Every structure is written in structure tokens, then in C-alpha cells.
């Protein structure tokens, strides 16, 4: 249990952070992500339109099963394509959904596009306020009035998991994460303090742990960082790779984690279900700890 | 980390216990199990030699490529059938065992076939100490100079973790499965606190911590059961039964366990894949812990 108490988030209806065990783990999944074969043109934004149709029904299918909600992890490469896929999503699931890509000026340049929309407001995540934030990363941000953004509390000055608390905090004259978050007009954060590869994933997790203790801000991580390039383990094929994923994907969980960047949503239908196995047996510690659940839709009730 | 000084136990060679991260996970595989179809006979011990030597040969190879020791699970249903599969055993790996049968009666009856034999004495764990022991079969423990045994806390009669604590240190008129076991002569002590189904494998783990806290034992569980009758996830297929049974398995890893009993010697080659995954992780967190590694053979320093 964490001694502060837990921001419960509702996302367009998902239910982000809390105590473990009172609320499922929040699976995100990556579409359109650099040499996702569902996209024929990553500067225009031409893509399987029927294909990714069928990842976010399969999405909501599992969703349905496990009683993990979802939050889409939308990726682009140029403002076009990315502009086009977030139009895309909008009207294709009722999921939020993350801004996101490798470099800033493409999320910039997709918030000018999309606006100031009020369906923009409550499902667009900015994915992320990190570091070498701009401000006019942060101008856009405002703009286009969006209320949620992850958080990237990550550095390499800020390797040890107390040293999130400087990142979101400040430090010096340093203006902290949360601080330039705020300027911005977001209120609700998603704090995810990084992973560089599959090992360092314990040390993101014990930053999980110090962000919810002392803040209660919902904490999760991309553990698919590092996993998708282990040849050594994903040329071993199924179900090697799955389950080494498994175990890399589980353990956040497995400490109190809120969410996961699972990576390419083709592997929803594993990952499903190694996280819901791992929720049902921590919220079957609740009948220990008195923690009750905040919802009847959780993998406990739902997989066995 | 835990509060009591770990028992680190040297098992003819196999660390076994410790801290977390301090020691991988040592890795119990089932053989000549009820319906293992290597078996053509499992009344008289015959069985396929050269595809039981595979499976040991495959134990040890996937071990020399983790650095996760490995303990054979040997199980018979008959005196003859075990002594044989003892016998071969020795013979045919160099490692620990376990001498296993749901029948006390043929456990005993075996270990008598066996006498007094230093090689016993350093290789064969008793599995297991549980609460319908007898005299009988403590002084047959104590004939054969046993060190090591499995303390099995599983009873419907002791569901909640204090429930399993008490069935282990005693209470009231009952001395305790560790007292009994002192009185067999032995002075090792894998506890296994059982495992009554999937969801509950976190009160397990709860048990496990509790043994570590106060006592110091080595703690493990063998889930293999409960999700073998996962009629729901079963159903489903490769790779979703692999990944569900890794995150039961690796589950009692993340919150500090010593061992698993992961089922059947067939599915080594996916078990070592998820678990040396977690052991890899929680090894990187030693620093945080203040641990150090008791081996170079370990996951972190393999298999990436
Ligand atoms: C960098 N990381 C990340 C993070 O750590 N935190 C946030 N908030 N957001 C993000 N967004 C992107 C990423 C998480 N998602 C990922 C992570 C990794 C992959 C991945 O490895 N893709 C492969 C190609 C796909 C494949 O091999 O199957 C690659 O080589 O790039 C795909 C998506
Ligand atoms: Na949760
Ligand atoms: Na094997």
C-alpha cells in the first residue's frame, strides 16, 4: 500500500493509477510505430484502414474478456501521417488514445491540426512532456486545451528512482516536469519514469514505486523498449518470446504499476493475457489487505 | 529485502535461498508424473531411457544458458517404480531431487529400497513433510540420514498465509511441520506453502514472504497444478496457457521466492525463458537493495 493517496484518473471512462490491486492495469498498444507493416507510406500517412480496423476491434474484444481497458499508443513520423491516424482513431474506437512520436515538431504540428476540440480535450494524451521540453511544446499544448499528458520523468542525470522526485519536482533552478506540465494546463498526469532496456526495468519500477508512494500520481513504463530488439530471445519464435515478454511486461505490474506500453498491438492477444493473470492474483491479495476494488470489471472475476 | 538472515543452502552444489537477487531461481521440471507417456509402465518403473536422458540432457543445457540451477522432481506411484526412477536417476544426471509421491507409503517404501548412502544423503530432498506425517515415516527419513526436505504447508485447513505460518512453526498442541522435520534429523528446509489455485498463488507468495521475513527458509511453490486445471486459459492455446502459466510461475520470483516446481520437465525450455527473464530484472535492483550477487551464473550476466 502507498502512503499517499492515489490519483484515480478517468480517462474517458478509463480508470488509470489508484492502490494495487483496486483498479486493473491499463494496456497500451502502439499502431502505426516505424515499420509497422500496416502503413505503405509513414510521410503521408497511407495505411490498412481495414487492418487497423481489426487491431482495435481485437482490442476492445480482449478489453472485453480481461476487463483491461485500453489506451491507444499512436505513432507518427510526419505531421500528415500523424494527423490522419489520430483522425483515424477518433472514429474507429472510443478508446483515448496517445499523441506520439519520436520528435516533438510532428506532435506540435498534429495538435494545430486537430484544434482545440473538445473530443480532442478528453481522449488525446500528450505522450510526453519529457526533459528537453519546449515551450513551444508547451504553447501547442495549451492551444489545443488538452487536460492529460505522460509525464516522461526520465533522465540519464536522473538514473536512480529517488531522482524522479527532482525531475518532477525541480531542482536548482531547474523548473520541474509537473511544474512546466501545469503552465501548459494540464491536470492530469500519467508519470512514466522510462526504460532503456529489459535489466533497467526494475530500477523504473522502484521509480514507479517512489512517484506513487510520495506522490500518488498513476505510474507505468514502456517495458516493450528493449524487448522487440532481443534477437537472442525473439528469433528463439513461440512461445520463447512471448514468454520472456511476459515476464519483462508483468513485472511492473507485479510491484504496483498502473499501465504498460506493451508495444505493436499484434501481440495484444498474448499480452492480454499474461497481465490480466497477474492483476487477478494481486487483487486476490485485497481479501488480505482489505483493499476493496474499484470496479466489478477486473480480471479476477472475469478470466477463471 | 527480508528482515531475517536467509539460509543460503549449498544442495550438493545447487545454491539455493538467499536475498533477492543474491541467487537465481532454482528450477524443479516433473518426471515420470501421472500420465508422463515416457512411462509404458507406471507400476513397475518402465519407462523410455533415452527420452528421459533427453529430458535431463535438455535441463542441463537450458541451465548451462540461464545460470538457473536445476532439482529433478522425481515422482512414482509405486515402491518399485520410484526406487527405479531413483536409481536412473543418480546414475544419469548429476543433480538434486526431489523423492515425490502423493502416497507417503511408497516415498517411504522407496527410501528403505534406498538405505544408507552418502550420495543419497547429499542429492535425494524429501518432498515432502506435510501434515499427515507419521513416526513411521520420520524415522525412515532419519534411517536414510536425510538433510534437506520440502516442509509443504498445502492443507484446506490452512488457506489464509498465518494459517500456513502456524502449520509450519506450530501452534497450540500441534509442534509444527519444521519441529517434525528437526525430529526426522533434518536440517534444510525448502518451504513450500502450496498453491490451491491460481488466483490464491499470491497468498502463496504472501506465505513465502512471511517464511523469509521471520525464519530465513529458502520459500518456493509449485503452481503447475492450479494452471493445468485453468480449464478457461488451457482452452485457449499456445502461446496464451505459456504466457499465463509464466506469469504464475515468475509471479512469486517478483515478490522474492528462492525456487518454482514449474510442472512437467517438457515445458523447461519456455519456464527458463520467463523466469531467467525476472531473475534478470531483480538482480539489476540489487544496488537499491543493497545485495550482492552470491554467483557470476546468473540470468543478468547470460542471456542478453
Ligand atoms: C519509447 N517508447 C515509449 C516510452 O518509453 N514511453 C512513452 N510514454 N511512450 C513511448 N512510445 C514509444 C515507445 C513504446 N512503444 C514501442 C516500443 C518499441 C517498439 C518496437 O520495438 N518496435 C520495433 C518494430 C516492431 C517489431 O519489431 O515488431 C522497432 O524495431 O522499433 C514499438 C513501440
Ligand atoms: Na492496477
Ligand atoms: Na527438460
Redo the contacts with the bound molecule.
Sequence with gaps: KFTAQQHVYDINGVKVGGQPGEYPTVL?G?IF????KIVSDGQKGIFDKDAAKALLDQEAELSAETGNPFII?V?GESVEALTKYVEFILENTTAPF?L?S?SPDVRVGALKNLGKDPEIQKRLIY??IEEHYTEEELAAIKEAGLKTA?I?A?SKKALKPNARIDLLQGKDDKEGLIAAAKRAGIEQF?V?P??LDVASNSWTTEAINVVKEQFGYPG???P??????WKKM?SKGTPFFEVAGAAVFTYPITQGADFI????M??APWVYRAIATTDAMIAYNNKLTGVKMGTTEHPLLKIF
Tied chains: 1, 2.
Excluded at 510505430?33 to 509497422?36: K, L, S
Excluded at 506500453?261 to 505493436?264: E, F, R
Design positions: 497500451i502502439s510505430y516505424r515499420g509497422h499508443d505513432l496517445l506520439d519520436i505522450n510526453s505522460v516522461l526520465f500519467l512514466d522510462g526504460v507505468g513504463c514502456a516493450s523498449n528493449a524487448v522487440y530488439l525473439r506500453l506493451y508495444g505493436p499484434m501481440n
